Nucleic acid binder design. Structure first.
Ligand SMILES: [Mg+2]
Length: 141
DNA sequence: CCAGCGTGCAGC
DNA sequence: GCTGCGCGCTGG
């Protein structure tokens, strides 16, 4: 399952191979523009390349990175706990994890697994991708 | 100038 | 169901 690239360039399209990273991206984009968030995301993944590492992080360090994005303390603590549960808790869908809601979940079920037909998103960008996909899937296979 | 917004979410 | 978290960007 390789979700296709779209004319809307959701960052999920390039991060689907690694659900932890895709899901971290969703968190980064919580009421934050991609213009601001996505450059910080690469710095974050540089310092914390995986959930194995991130769940050991000092949340104050993470907060320093998030400072320009707003929601810096909330999200930094969420990121460390989310990463912890991602690896340690039994889950089937990541909505079961702290810090992931419907939008993150929908992103997961569209990009990381082949369940896009079953998803009913309520997020504007995601709907654009998801609607577009219903219209072009036969054409793309 | 500065109010509205940004690919939300958990807690209550 | 509502609210707090929160910065920089935007555009009249
Ligand atoms: Mg959750």
């Amino acid at each position: 399952w390789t979700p296709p690239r779209s004319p809307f360039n959701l960052v999920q399209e390039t991060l689907f191979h690694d659900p932890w990273k895709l899901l971290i991206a969703t968190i980064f984009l919580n009421r934050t523009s991609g213009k601001m968030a996505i450059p910080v995301l690469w710095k974050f993944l540089e310092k914390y390349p995986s959930a194995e590492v991130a769940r050991t992080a000092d949340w104050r360090d993470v907060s320093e990175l998030l400072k320009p994005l707003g929601l810096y303390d909330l999200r930094a603590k969420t990121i460390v706990k989310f990463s912890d549960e991602y690896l340690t808790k039994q889950w089937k869908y990541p909505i079961e994890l702290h810090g992931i809601g419907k939008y993150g979940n929908d992103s997961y079920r569209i990009f990381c697994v082949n369940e896009w037909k079953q998803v009913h998103p309520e997020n504007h960008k995601l709907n654009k991708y998801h609607d577009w996909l219903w219209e072009n899937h036969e054409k793309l296979s």
